[PDB]
Amino acid sequence: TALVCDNGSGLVKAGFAGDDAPRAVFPSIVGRPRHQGVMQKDSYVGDEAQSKRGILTLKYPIEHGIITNWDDMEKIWHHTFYNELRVAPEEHPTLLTEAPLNPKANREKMTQIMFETFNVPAMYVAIQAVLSLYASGRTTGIVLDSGDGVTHNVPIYEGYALPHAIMRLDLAGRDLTDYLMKILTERGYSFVTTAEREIVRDIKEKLCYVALDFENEMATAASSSSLEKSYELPDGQVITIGNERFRCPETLFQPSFIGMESAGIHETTYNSIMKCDIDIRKDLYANNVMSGGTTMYPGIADRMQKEITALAPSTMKIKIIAPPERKYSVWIGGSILASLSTFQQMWITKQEYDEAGPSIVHRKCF
Amino acid sequence: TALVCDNGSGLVKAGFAGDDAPRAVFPSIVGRPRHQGVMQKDSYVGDEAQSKRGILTLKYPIEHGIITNWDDMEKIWHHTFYNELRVAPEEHPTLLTEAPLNPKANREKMTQIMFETFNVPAMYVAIQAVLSLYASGRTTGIVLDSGDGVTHNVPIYEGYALPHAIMRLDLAGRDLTDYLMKILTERGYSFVTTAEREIVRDIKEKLCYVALDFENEMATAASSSSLEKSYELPDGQVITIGNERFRCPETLFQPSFIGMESAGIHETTYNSIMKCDIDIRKDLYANNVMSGGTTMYPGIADRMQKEITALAPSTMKIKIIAPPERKYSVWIGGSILASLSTFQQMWITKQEYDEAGPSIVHRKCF
Amino acid sequence: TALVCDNGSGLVKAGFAGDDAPRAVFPSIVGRPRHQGVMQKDSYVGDEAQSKRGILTLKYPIEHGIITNWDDMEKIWHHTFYNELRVAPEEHPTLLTEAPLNPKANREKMTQIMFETFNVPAMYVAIQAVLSLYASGRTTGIVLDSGDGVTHNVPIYEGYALPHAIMRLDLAGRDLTDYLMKILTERGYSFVTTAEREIVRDIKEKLCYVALDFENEMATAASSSSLEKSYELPDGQVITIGNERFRCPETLFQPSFIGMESAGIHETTYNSIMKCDIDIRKDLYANNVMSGGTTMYPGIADRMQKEITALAPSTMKIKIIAPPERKYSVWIGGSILASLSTFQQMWITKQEYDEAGPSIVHRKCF
Amino acid sequence: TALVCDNGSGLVKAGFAGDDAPRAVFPSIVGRPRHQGVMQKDSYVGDEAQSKRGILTLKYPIEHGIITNWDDMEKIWHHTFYNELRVAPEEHPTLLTEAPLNPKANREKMTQIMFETFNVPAMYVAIQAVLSLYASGRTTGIVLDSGDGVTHNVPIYEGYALPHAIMRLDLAGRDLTDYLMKILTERGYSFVTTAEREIVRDIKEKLCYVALDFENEMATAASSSSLEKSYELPDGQVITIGNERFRCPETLFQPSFIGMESAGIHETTYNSIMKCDIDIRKDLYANNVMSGGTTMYPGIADRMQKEITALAPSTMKIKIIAPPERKYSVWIGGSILASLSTFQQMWITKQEYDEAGPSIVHRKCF
Amino acid sequence: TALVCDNGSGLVKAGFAGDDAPRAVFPSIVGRPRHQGVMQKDSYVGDEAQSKRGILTLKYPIEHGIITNWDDMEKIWHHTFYNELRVAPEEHPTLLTEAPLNPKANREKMTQIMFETFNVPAMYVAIQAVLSLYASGRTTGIVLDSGDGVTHNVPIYEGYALPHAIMRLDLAGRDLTDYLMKILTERGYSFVTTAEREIVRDIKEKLCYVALDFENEMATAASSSSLEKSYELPDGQVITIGNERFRCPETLFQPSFIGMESAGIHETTYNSIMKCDIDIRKDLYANNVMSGGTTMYPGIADRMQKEITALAPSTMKIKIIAPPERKYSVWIGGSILASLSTFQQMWITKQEYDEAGPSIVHRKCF
Ligand SMILES: Nc1ncnc2c1ncn2[C@@H]1O[C@H](COP(=O)(O)OP(=O)(O)O)[C@@H](O)[C@H]1O
Ligand SMILES: Nc1ncnc2c1ncn2[C@@H]1O[C@H](COP(=O)(O)OP(=O)(O)O)[C@@H](O)[C@H]1O
Ligand SMILES: Nc1ncnc2c1ncn2[C@@H]1O[C@H](COP(=O)(O)OP(=O)(O)O)[C@@H](O)[C@H]1O
Ligand SMILES: Nc1ncnc2c1ncn2[C@@H]1O[C@H](COP(=O)(O)OP(=O)(O)O)[C@@H](O)[C@H]1O
Ligand SMILES: Nc1ncnc2c1ncn2[C@@H]1O[C@H](COP(=O)(O)OP(=O)(O)O)[C@@H](O)[C@H]1O
Ligand code: BEF
Ligand code: BEF
Ligand code: BEF
Ligand code: BEF
Ligand code: BEF
Ligand SMILES: [Ca+2]
Ligand SMILES: [Ca+2]
Ligand SMILES: [Ca+2]
Ligand SMILES: [Ca+2]
Ligand SMILES: [Ca+2]
C-alpha cells in the first residue's frame, strides 16, 4: 500500500492510501533545548516537542510552503516514518504534496532525499489543489486552499487546470497568529517566545471567527461586552479578548492590516475567475471549494459568499463548498488518488529516477 | 433508405431521405484541449465541443465551402454516422452536397473517403441550389444561397441550369461574425478566442437585423436609444449594442465594410439575371428564392425586394421567396430528391467507382 | 509650436513638434501612500512616484491602450504640461496618439478633457502606426508596434491604409513583465508588490533577449551556465537567472506560455500581409517596420526575419526595418507630422468642436 | 509655551518646548521609609529619594514602558510640575511620550489624569521614535531606541512609518543592571536591596562598555589584568571588576545570557529592515539612528556597525548615527515638534476630550 | 567507593555513596579555649567542641554558604576524613556540594585543597538543588532549600535547570537563631556568648513552629497561656516562652523582622515560578520540594501551601513536597548521584586538574 504524506508549513498529515483520515497528524516543528541540562535528548519533533516546549526553542522547517533547513525537515520525515506510521520507507510508494508556484529546487531536493536517504521504491509529488478537488468528488471548481504558510487559488474545469489563472499568496495561518500576538499587546498580554506563539495559535483556533460585516461588528464590540470571551492560559491565568476575535481573521480579507499590498482572498478568488475563459466562469462561480485549516474559521464561508456575490454579476449563482472535513482535504484527496488504478502508471520509480535525473519530477507541475 | 448529409461550413444537417427535417443538426467544429489535464478525451465534435468550448480550441474543417483538414472532416462524418444518426454507413446510399465552383479535388477526396473509409454502397454529390429549388416546389428561379462560408446565385429555368450566370461570393455568415467581433470593440467589448467567436455568433443570430434604409437607421440610432438591445453573456455580464445590430448584416449589401471589392448580394443577383437570356429574365425576377442561415436576418427579404426593384425595370414584378424553413432548404430538397423514383438511377455505386475512377463524380457538376 | 504627447500604457513621451527626441519621458504611473504618515503629498506621478515607490501603491491609468481611471490620467496630463514641459496648455495645439481598434469613448473623453480642462486651442489624435512610418521616412510598409499594453500590425501601401488587415493583440511589455515575475518563482525569487513589479521590468529590459532558435537555447541553458547573468536588487541582493532571459520574450512568439490562444507576432504579421491584396504583398514583405519598446529585445529582428522567411514564399525578400531609435518612433513621427505645412488644416480647433460635437474626432480613425 | 515631559521607565525628562535640553532630569522613583521613625515625610520622589535611599524602599512605577502603580506615577507628575518645573499645569499644553506597542489603557489612563487631575488645557502623546528622528533632523531612518525598560526598532521612510516592521523588546537598561548584580556575586560582591541596585546602575554607567569582539575580549580578560577597573562604593569599599565590564552590555547582543529567547539588537534591527519594502532598505541601512541611555555604552556603535555589516549584503553602506546627545533625543525631538507651527492643530484640547471620549487619544498611534 | 561530603554553614553531613543516611553528622564549628589552662588541646572540632563549649569560643568557618577562614575549614575536613569516617582521602573520589550563586574563588580554593592537601583521586562539586531533586526521585520541580546559612530556590523542569530564575537569600537558620536571641531578652533571658547561641539553637529546634495565620496566633498568645512551653537550660534553670515560638520562624515569611528588605520564602518561590516559561509553571506549582534543616519547622509546609495558593491562580494545584528525611536531602541525593553509572564520567580527576587548571571546576555551574 502507498503512503500519503502531506507536509504542510504547520502540520504533518501522514497515513496510508485507502484510509479516510490521516493516521498521524502532528505539528511540523523541531524543538531544541535552550537551557542547561543538569540531570536529555538533543532534539524533539512534533507532539513531543509540543509537550516540552517550555524549555525548547521551536522552529518550523517549512516557511511559506518552502522547505528551509533541510536537516530539520529530514528529522520530521524520519519521525513520520519510524515513530508515527511505524513502517519501512523502502516498502511503500510515497505520495507527497507541494504548493503551486514553488521553487524548482524544493521538489528536486525532497525527491533526492526520498530516493537516496529513505530509499522509497516510487514516489510522486501531487498538486494540492487537484487533491482537494478529488476529496470533494468534483472535476470542476476553483479551489481556495489556505493552510499555515500558503494561500492559493487554482481553477480547474472538467479536469483541466488553468495554470495562468493560479494565484498564490504568502499570507496564511502563521501570519494570522503573528498578527494576533501583536494586537493582544493592546490589552497588556505579552506573548514573545516561540512556545508562547503556540499558545496564541490555540487561542486563534478556539476563539477567532470571521465577521459577516466587519465595520458593524467593530461598533458592536465597542458598545457592549457580548463578544468578550475568556481563555485560560497553561499557568491558570485567564485572559479576555473582544474585537481581536474577528480582527485577526479579517486580515484574510484586508491584508493591509499586516502591511501587505495584495487583495483579500475574496478579490483574489474573483480575479482568478476573471482570468479564466468567459465560458467556464459560471461553473467556477458555483464550485468555490475551500480547503485547509485556515478556512475553518466560523463564518468564513458566509463572508466569502457575500464578498464574491458583491463582485460577480447578479445573475450568477455563487456557491461556496466548505465540507466539515476540509482541514484534511489535501490528504483525503491524495488517499483517493493513490488508490486509483489509472494512477499506478504515474509513480516515479527509483529506476526511472537514476536514468532521467531530477528533471523527471517536474512533469504536470506548476 | 438513403442518408442525406448537408455538410456546410458552419452546420452539419444530416438525416434520412423522406423526412421533413434533418434529424441531426450540430456545429461543424472539432475542439481540442488547449490546457493541461490533471484529473479526458483527445478531441470533441459538434455539440459536445460546443458545451466544453471554454477549455477547447475550436476549429472548422470547412472554410468557404472547401474542406481543409481532411482528418477533422473525417471525425465529423464519423460523429455523424455513429453518434448522431446511429446507423451503419455501409447499408445506406448517401446524398452529399457541395457549393458550386468548388475545386475538383474537394469532391474527389470526399468520394474516396465515403467509398473506402465508410464503405457506403452508393453516393451522389448534388447541387445545393438545385436542392433549394426542390424544397420550394419550383422548377424555375434564381436561388440566393448564403450559409456560413459561401454565398452563391444559381439561375434555373424550367429545370435547366445556366452555369455561365452562376455567381459565387466567399462572403457569408462567418465573415459577418468576424466583422461583428471587430465593431464590438468600439464599445469596449473584447472577443478574441475561438470560444468567444461562438458567443458573438449567438449575439448575431439573436439581435442583428437588416435595415430597410441604412443611412436613415444610422441617423435614428445616433439620435436615441430605441434600437439598443441588451444581451447576457455566459458569465452574467450584460452588453448593450446599438447600430451594430444592423451594421453587421449591412456587409452583405456593402462588402466594402470588410475590405472586399465585390458588389452586394442585391447587385450580384441582378448581375446574374442580366447574364441570362432576355426571354427568361421576367420569370427569374418573380422567383428569387432565398436559402441558408444567412438569409434568416429579419428584414433581408424586404431589403432585397427594395434593392432589386431599384435595379430592374419598373414593369417587372420582383418577388422574393423566403419560406420560414429556408435555413434547411438544401437538406429538405435533398430529402425530396433522394426519394424520387427517377433519381434511383443517378446513384454512383461502389462498382461503378472502382472501374470508372474519380472522374465519374464530375457529371452534371459545375 | 505644437505639443506632441504620446501617452502609452507604460511611458509618457512628450515634447515639442520639430525636435528630434521627446523632452519628457517618464512612467505613466500614479503612486499613493499605503502606510501611515507620522512626520507628505497625497499622490505622486511619474519619476517622483518611481523614486518613492517603496511606500507607494503604483497604478497605471492606461491598461492595454485604454484609459481606465480618468482622474489619474488627468493628473498625468497635468504633471506633463506644468511639471515636465512647463508650458501653458492653452497656447499650443496638442497632437495625441491612440492605439487602433480602441473604444470610441476613449478618444471622445480625452478630447473633452483637452478642450474643457486644459483649454487647448486645437488638437488631433493621430494613428500610431502612421506616425511610425513617418519616423522611418517611408510611405509603404507594415508596422509592428509593440509597447507596454498593445501590440498591433498596420499595413500601409503608398500612403493608403488597409484597415481590414489591421491586427491588434493585447499582449505587450506589461504581460511579459508579469510572466517574468511568475517564472522567477521557479528560482525562489518572490516579487509581489507593484513596486517589485517595477524591479522585474528593469530586469527584463537589461537581461532578456530573444533566442534565434528557442529549443536549441533551452538545451544550451540546461547543459552549462554560459547563459547565466547576475542582477543586483536595490537592497544589495544578487539574483541569477538563466533560461528566463529568453523564455520571457519567447511569449511574443508563443502566446500560449501565458494562456493566450492567439498566434505569435510573426504569424500575426504574416496573416496581416496575407489579408492584403496580392499585388502589394511583395512591398510589405520588404518593409516590416518595428516600433515600440517591446521591439527593443536583442535578437528580435533576426528572429522575426527567420520566422517570416519560413512562412513566406522563398522568392520573397523579407526585410525587417528596426532603427535604433524605434522606441520613440511614434513620438518622432508625430513631431514630423505636426511640423508639416499640409497638416495645419487637420487640427480640430476649439471652435469646430463646440459646433460639430464629439463626432468630429472620429475622422480618418480606425 | 508647551511642556515636554518624557516619562521613561528610569528617568523623567521634563522641560519647555523650544529649549535645547530638558530642564528637569531625575530618576522615576518613589521611596518610602522601611524603618521606624523616632525623631519625616511619608514618601520621597526623584533625587530626594535617591539621596535618602539608605533608609528607603525604592520602587519604579513604570515597568517596561508600562505604568504600574498609578498612585506613585501621579506623585512623580506632581513632583515634576510643582517641584522641578515650578509651573501651573493648567496653563501649558503638555506633550507626552509612550513606547510603541503599549497597552491601550496605559495611554487612556494618563490622558484622564492629565485632564482631570492636573487640568491641562491640551495634550498629545507622541511616538518616541518619531521624536528621535526629529532630533537628528532626519525624515528617513530606522530608530533603535533603548532606555531603561524598552528597546524598540521603528523604521521611518520619507516621513511615513511602517508599523508592521516595528520590533519591541522588553530588554533594556534595568535588565542589564539586574544581570550585572548577578555576575558581581562571582567576585563575592553582594548587592541585594533596591538601594544597592542604584549603586550597581552607577557602576554600569561608568565602567561597562561593549566589546568589538566578545570572544577575543574574554581571552584578553583571562590572560592579564589590563581590563580591570576599580570602583569606590559609597562607604569607602573598593571593588574591582574585569570581564563583567563587557559581559553586562553583551546581553544586548546575546539575550540568552538572561534566559531570553529573542535575538540581539543587531539581528532585530536587521530583521526589521528585511520586513520593509526592498526599495527602502538601502536608505534604512544608511540611517540607523541610536537613541536612549542604553545606547551610551562605549563601543556600541562600532559593534552594531560590525554586526549589521555581517548580516547585510556587501554592497550596502551601513551607517550608525549616534549623536553625543542621543540620551535626550526623545525629549529634544519633542521640544522641536511642540514648537512647529504645523503641529498646533494636533493638540487634543480639553473640549475635544469631553465629547469624543478616551478614543480620541488613539489617533496616529501604534 | 565515593565519599559524599555535604559541608553546610551549620552541619557537616559526610558518608559513603550508596548508603541511605550520612555516617557522620556534626556541627561545622571550631572551638578554641578562651581562658587560662592551669592543669589541653589547642582547638576542638564538631561534637568535641560542642561538649566543651563552656570554656571555648565557637566559630563557624562557613558564613552564608561561603567559606571564610580557610584554616578552620581545613581542620573540619581533616576531622571529617580521619576522625569521623576514618578513611584515607587519597583512595576515594569525593563529591562536594555548594550553594548556587557563590563566589567563583570559593569552589576553586576547595578544589585546590582537596587535590593538593588531601590528595583525593577525583572530585566533583554538585548543585545542591539538583541533589535534593535526586533524593525525592523527581526530574521536575522547584526546590526550596533552606539550611543554616543560605535559602535558595532552583526551578528544574524535565532535568533542565533554569538558572535565570534562581533566587538566593542570605536568610536561614543562623539568622533565625540570632533573632530568637534578640526577642528572648523581652522576657529577661540574656544569651550572649557563642556557647549560649548553641543553647538558643536547641530551643529553636525543639519549641519553634510556623503559625498558619500569624495575626490570629498573636491574639491567641496574648489572651491565654496555652502556647507557653518550658525549657530547662543546661544549668537547671527553666525558661518559659510564648509567642516567641512562632515569631522566630515567621521571619522566613516576613524578613522585615530582622531589617531585611527581601520578600518572604513564599513570595520568593512564587516570583521564581513567574520568571519561568508559562508552559512549565503548572508542573512547578505541583512539585514544590522542601529540603534543609530550616524547613523542619512544624507547620511550614501547610503555611507555604496557604501562602502560594493565595498568590497563584485558583485553578492551579499547589503541592508542597516535604518528606520526613528532607533535612538530609542534599546528602541523600549526592549518595544517589555518586552511585549512578552515567556519573562516573563526570569526576574531575587529579590528572585533568593539573593540565586544565582551576577553570575545569566551573562546568555545569551557576
Ligand atoms: N479551527 C481552526 N480555526 C482557525 N484556524 C485553524 C483551525 N484549525 C487549524 N487552523 C490553522 O490552520 C493552519 C494549518 O492548517 P493546514 O491546512 O494543515 O496547513 P499546512 O497544510 O500548511 O500545514 C494552522 O496555522 C492553524 O492555525
Ligand atoms: N437567425 C439567424 N440570423 C442570422 N444568421 C443566422 C441565423 N441562424 C443561422 N445563421 C447563420 O447561418 C450560418 C449557417 O447557416 P447554414 O446555411 O447552415 O450554413 P452552412 O450550410 O454553410 O453551414 C451561420 O454562420 C449562422 O451564423
Ligand atoms: N531595452 C528594452 N528591452 C525590452 N523591453 C523594453 C526595453 N525598453 C523598454 N521596454 C519595454 O517597452 C514597454 C514600453 O514601451 P513603449 O513603446 O513606450 O510603450 P507604450 O508606448 O505603450 O507606453 C515597457 O513595457 C518596457 O518594459
Ligand atoms: N553612560 C551610560 N552607559 C550605559 N548606560 C547608561 C548610561 N547612562 C544612562 N544609562 C542607562 O540608560 C537607562 C535610562 O535611559 P533613558 O533613555 O532615559 O530610559 P527611559 O527613557 O526608559 O527612562 C538607564 O537604565 C541607565 O542605566
Ligand atoms: N527540627 C528543626 N526545626 C527547626 N530548625 C532546625 C531543625 N533541625 C535543624 N534546624 C536548623 O537547620 C539548620 C541547618 O540545617 P542544614 O540544612 O544542615 O544547614 P547547612 O546544610 O547549611 O548546614 C540549623 O540552623 C538548624 O538550626
Ligand atoms: F503549507 Be500550508 F499548506 F500553508
Ligand atoms: F458552407 Be455554407 F453553405 F456557407
Ligand atoms: F500603450 Be503602449 F503603446 F502598448
Ligand atoms: F522607558 Be525607557 F524609554 F526604556
Ligand atoms: F549552608 Be546551609 F546549606 F545554609
Ligand atoms: Ca497544506
Ligand atoms: Ca449550406
Ligand atoms: Ca506606444
Ligand atoms: Ca525613553
Ligand atoms: Ca545545606
The SS3 of residue E366 is: coil
Q: Whose CA is nearest to atom 2 of ligand 6?
A: A147
Residue A319 in contact with residue A286, Cβ under 8 Å? yes
Q: Residue type at E333?
A: G
Contacts of D31 (CB under 8 A, 6+ apart): D43, D44, D45, D48, D49, D50, D52, D53, D56, D57, D58, D59
Report the C-alpha gap between B206 and A13 in whole angstroms. 54
Q: Residue type at D140?
A: T
Helix ranges (H only) for chain C are 47-51, 70-79, 104-116, 128-135, 173-184, 194-207, 214-221, 244-250, 265-274, 281-285, 300-311, 329-337, 350-356
State the Cα torsion D210-D212-D217-D218 to the nearest 10°: 70
CA neighbor of C160 nearest in space, from C316, C334, C276, C282: C276
CA neighbor of B180 nearest in space, from B251, B235, B229: B251
CA of B6 to the centre of ligand 12 (A): 7
What element of type H or E holds E7? Answer: strand E3-7
Q: Residue A15: how many CA atoms within 13 Å on its side-chain side?
A: 21
Q: A340 to each of A18, A22, A139, C271, D232, how far by Cα in Å?
A: 9, 18, 15, 46, 83
* Strand pairing report for C66-67 and C62-63: antiparallel
Contacts of D203 (CB under 8 A, 6+ apart): D180, D231, D239, D241
Q: Residue type at C337?
A: L
Residue appearing with cell numbers 469631553: D354
B251: its cell numbers: 456587409
Report the C-alpha gap between D9 and B139 in whole angstroms. 111
Q: Where are the beta strands (DSSP E) in E53-169?
A: 56-59, 62-63, 66-67, 94-98, 122-127, 141-146, 151-157, 160-161, 167-169
E210: its cell numbers: 510556623
D97: its cell numbers: 511620550
What element of type H or E holds D331? Answer: helix D329-337
Nearest to A186 among D103, D164, D275 (CB): D103
**Phi and psi at residue D27, in whole multiples of 5°?**
-65, 145
**Phi and psi at residue D302, in whole multiples of 5°?**
-70, -35
Report the C-alpha gap between D168 and D143 in whole angstroms. 12
Q: Is the dihedral of CA A140, A144, A146, A150 positive or negative?
A: positive
Q: E352 to each of B141, D284, E112, E213, how far by Cα in Å?
A: 124, 52, 13, 54
Report the C-alpha gap between E79 and E233 in whole angstroms. 29
> Cα Rg for chain C, rounded, in angstroms?
21
Q: C246 to each of A359, C213, C262, C308, how far by Cα in Å?
A: 20, 10, 20, 19
- Asked if C195 lies within 8 A of D278 by C-beta distance, the reply is yes
Report the C-alpha gap between D178 and E164 in whole angstroms. 11
Report the C-alpha gap between D16 and D5 in whole angstroms. 8
* Strand pairing report for D320-321 and D288-291: parallel
Q: What angle do CA A190, A192, A193 make, to 5 degrees?
A: 140
Q: Residue E44: how many CA atoms within 13 Å on its side-chain side?
A: 21
Nearest to E161 among A38, A233, A236 (CB): A38
CA neighbor of E26 nearest in space, from E58, E1, E64: E58
* Strand pairing report for D288-291 and D66-67: unpaired
B224: its cell numbers: 436615441
Q: Residue type at D202?
A: D
Helix ranges (H only) for chain E are 47-51, 70-79, 104-116, 128-135, 173-184, 194-207, 214-221, 244-250, 265-274, 281-285, 300-311, 329-337, 350-356
Identify the burial level of E108 via C-beta atoms within 10 angstroms of its C-beta, where 0-12 means exposed, 13-18 middle and 19 or more buried.
Answer: middle
* Strand pairing report for C122-127 and C94-98: parallel
How many residues make up chain D in this entry? 366
CA of E93 to the centre of ligand 5 (A): 27
* Cβ B9 under 6 angstroms from ligand 7: yes
Give the per-residue SS3 of A225-254: CCCCEEEECCCCCEEEECCHHHHHHHCCCC
CA neighbor of A128 nearest in space, from A162, A105, A151: A151
Neighbours of C197 (CB within 10 A): 18
Report the C-alpha gap between E182 and E175 in whole angstroms. 11
Q: Whose CA is nearest to atom 3 of ligand 9?
A: D147
The SS3 of residue C81 is: helix
Report the C-alpha gap between B274 and B276 in whole angstroms. 5
- Asked if C275 lies within 8 A of B258 by C-beta distance, the reply is no
What element of type H or E holds D6? Answer: strand D3-7
- Asked if D130 lies within 8 A of C39 by C-beta distance, the reply is yes
CA of E54 to the centre of ligand 15 (A): 27
Distance spanning both ends of chain B, measured CA to CA:
27
A262: its cell numbers: 495584495
Report the C-alpha gap between A356 and A175 in whole angstroms. 39
Give the per-residue SS3 of chain B: CCEEEEECCCEEEEEECCCCCCCEEEECCEEEECCEECCCCCCEECHHHHHCHHHEEEECCEECCEECCHHHHHHHHHHHHHHHHCCCHHHCCEEEEECCCCCHHHHHHHHHHHHHCCCCCEEEEEEHHHHHHHHCCCCCEEEEEECCCCEEEEEEECCEECHHHCEEECCCHHHHHHHHHHHHHHHCCCCCCHHHHHHHHHHHHHHCCCCCCHHHHHHHHCCCCCCCEEEECCCCCEEEECCHHHHHHHCCCCHHHHCCCCCCHHHHHHHHHHCCCHHHHHHHHCCEEEECHHHCCCCHHHHHHHHHHHHCCCCCCCCEECCCCHHHHHHHHHHHHCCCCCCCCCCEEHHHHHHHCHHHHCCCCC
Residue appearing with cell numbers 552564608: E64
C349: its cell numbers: 480647433
**Phi and psi at residue A41, in whole multiples of 5°?**
-80, 165
Report the C-alpha gap between B208 and A221 in whole angstroms. 57
Report the C-alpha gap between D4 and D19 in whole angstroms. 10
Domains and CATH numbers, chain B: 1-29+62-125+328-362 (3.30.420.40), 30-59 (2.30.36.70), 127-172+262-323 (3.30.420.40), 173-258 (3.90.640.10)
Q: Residue type at A50?
A: Q
Neighbours of B190 (CB within 10 A): 14
Residue appearing with cell numbers 516567641: E244
Q: Residue type at E144?
A: L
C354: its cell numbers: 463646440
Residue C4 in contact with residue C81, Cβ under 8 Å? no
Report the C-alpha gap between A346 and A344 in whole angstroms. 6
Burial A128-153 (b: 16+ CB within 10 A, else e): bbbbbbbbbebbbbbbbbbbbbbbbb
Cα B101 to chain centroid, rounded = 15
Going by the DSSP 8-state scheme, the letter that residue E14 receives in this structure is E
Q: Is the dihedral of CA D98, D103, D104, D109 positive or negative?
A: negative
Residue appearing with cell numbers 519647555: D16
Residue appearing with cell numbers 439598443: B228
Instruction: Quickly list DSSP for A245-309.
Output: HHHHHHTTT-GGGGT--SPPHHHHHHHHHHTS-GGGHHHHHT-EEEESGGG-STTHHHHHHHHHH
Contacts of D240 (CB under 8 A, 6+ apart): D187, D228, D229, D230, D231
Helix ranges (H only) for C90-164 are 104-116, 128-135
* Cβ B27 under 6 angstroms from ligand 2: no
Q: Where are the beta strands (DSSP E) in D194-304?
A: 229-232, 238-241, 288-291
CA neighbor of D272 nearest in space, from D150, D189, D156: D156
Report the C-alpha gap between D102 and D169 in whole angstroms. 12
The SS3 of residue C23 is: coil
Report the C-alpha gap between C262 and A18 in whole angstroms. 44
Report the C-alpha gap between B121 and E38 in whole angstroms. 154
Q: C146 to each of A53, C137, C258, C329, how far by Cα in Å?
A: 59, 19, 17, 11
Residue B96 in contact with residue B7, Cβ under 8 Å? yes
Q: Whose CA is nearest to atom 1 of ligand 4?
A: D205
Report the C-alpha gap between C83 and C90 in whole angstroms. 15
Nearest to B186 among C103, C163, C259 (CB): C103
D11: its cell numbers: 528617568
CA of E42 to the centre of ligand 3 (A): 104
Q: Residue type at C60?
A: Y
Neighbours of A257 (CB within 10 A): 18
Q: Residue C337: how many CA atoms within 13 Å on its side-chain side?
A: 33
Which chain E residues are within 8 Å of A235, Cβ to Cβ?
A: 278-279, 281-282, 313, 316
Q: Mutual orientation of helices E329-337 and E128-135 as an angle, nearest 10°? A: 80
**Phi and psi at residue E90, in whole multiples of 5°?**
-80, 10
Report the C-alpha gap between E198 and A147 in whole angstroms. 71
- Asked if B34 lies within 8 A of C261 by C-beta distance, the reply is yes
Cα diameter, chain B: 71
* Strand pairing report for E141-146 and E288-291: parallel
Residue A120 in contact with residue A149, Cβ under 8 Å? no
Report the C-alpha gap between E180 and E186 in whole angstroms. 10
* Cβ D150 under 6 angstroms from ligand 9: yes
**Phi and psi at residue A57, in whole multiples of 5°?**
-100, 115
Going by the DSSP 8-state scheme, the letter that residue C124 receives in this structure is E
CA neighbor of E333 nearest in space, from E4, E11, E98: E4
Burial E59-78 (b: 16+ CB within 10 A, else e): bbbbbbbbbeeeebbbbbbe
> Cα Rg for chain B, rounded, in angstroms?
21
Identify the burial level of A229 via C-beta atoms within 10 angstroms of its C-beta, where 0-12 means exposed, 13-18 middle and 19 or more buried.
Answer: middle
E266: its cell numbers: 513564599
C256: its cell numbers: 500560449
Residue B366 in contact with residue B161, Cβ under 8 Å? yes
Report the C-alpha gap between E125 and C68 in whole angstroms. 80
Burial C104-126 (b: 16+ CB within 10 A, else e): bebbbebbebbbeebebbbbbbb
Which chain E residues are within 8 Å of D35, Cβ to Cβ?
A: 259
* Cβ A297 under 6 angstroms from ligand 1: yes
Resolution reading in Å: 2.2
Q: Is the dihedral of CA C16, C22, C25, C30 positive or negative?
A: positive
- Asked if E261 lies within 8 A of D185 by C-beta distance, the reply is no
- Asked if D105 lies within 8 A of A193 by C-beta distance, the reply is no
